[PDB]
């Protein structure tokens, strides 16, 4: 019943497509905390190693985490893992994270509804899982797609807790809407 | 068959396992509580931010993000759960979190025959629509992500030891058979 087209049309729209919105959301969320930084004259270095908890990544590493999970997951569903650029997370001032979203964003941008053909069916295994699986699409929807959010909206509350007035807009984006 | 099935796993199913995370982590709460000698009370009204909605709000809309979003998915919304927002205890705020699930497992694949392409607006759009598929990927999914993330940072954030397993729960690990 053309179930090919459907499982890669969907998960290229999960993956590729939102978390690109998301990624620029997230880009638009730093816009804001340059604002407070000026505004409240908050050094941005401050905010970039804040964090929720002592033994919780800051908000450099949750940027980090969320780019990567974008493009390995993608990498990943793809079966293209061995040609994904690679990153050694040695940033620490906005500019370079802006660099790591751009970088992400412009991978992103590379793939096709095609190269999702077999991603509801391939087989993933991470290096910890002692040789099991997730079906592309279980690891999707159960994996991936949670982690993308979890990232980004620590990265989101870690900015909040410390003053800066980004709103639920701001992480969501704008919407398709139309016209009735 | 089509996107029937998709938009069901990604909404009835995944958000109710999530829920259930979401309930499992109050357990750890709970656990915390006990041995910090910490008065449920105090995590239930706590906050990341002055003006940002605290965890019982959290918690609520994380719920109401699911409910509705099934209900406009499918176009069922003659008759759903009506909460009010009066809970004030973890006990309420559990049954609150059941209330959902069972709802939610109410439904069938067959229930999103027409999911993709239904209209969605909202009471404040004014009119303006999106279609079901774009309301699922850009609006309920994450919305319920970002209500269930924040609760686990206020939680993570006054020293309840949750951890990402807490978060993403159990996965269907398979062994390799060819």
């Known amino acids: 019943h053309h179930e090919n087209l459907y499982f890669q049309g969907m998960l290229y729209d999960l993956t590729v497509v939102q978390f690109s919105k998301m990624l620029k ?3 638009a969320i730093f816009d804001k905390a340059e604002a407070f930084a000026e505004l409240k004259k908050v050094d941005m270095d401050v905010l970039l190693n ?11 590493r949750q940027v980090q985490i969320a780019c990567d999970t974008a493009k390995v997951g993608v990498a990943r569903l793809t079966g293209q893992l061995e040609t994904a650029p690679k990153h050694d997370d040695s940033e620490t001032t906005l500019a370079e994270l802006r660099q790591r979203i751009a970088s992400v964003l412009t991978y992103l941008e ?3 509804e ?5 991603a509801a069916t391939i087989q993933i295994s991470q290096p910890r899982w002692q040789g099991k699986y997730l079906t592309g699409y279980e690891f999707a929807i159960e994996h991936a797609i949670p982690n993308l959010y979890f990232h980004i909206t620590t990265a989101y509350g870690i900015l909040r807790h410390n ?3 980004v709103g639920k807009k701001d992480y969501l984006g704008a919407m398709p809407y139309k016209a009735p």
């Open 114 to 118: 095609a190269d999702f053909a077999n």
């Open 25 to 27: 959301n997230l880009n």
């Open 110 to 112: 590379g793939f096709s």
């Open 50 to 60: 804040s964090r929720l908890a002592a033994d919780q990544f800051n908000l450099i």
């Open 163 to 165: 003053g800066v007035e």
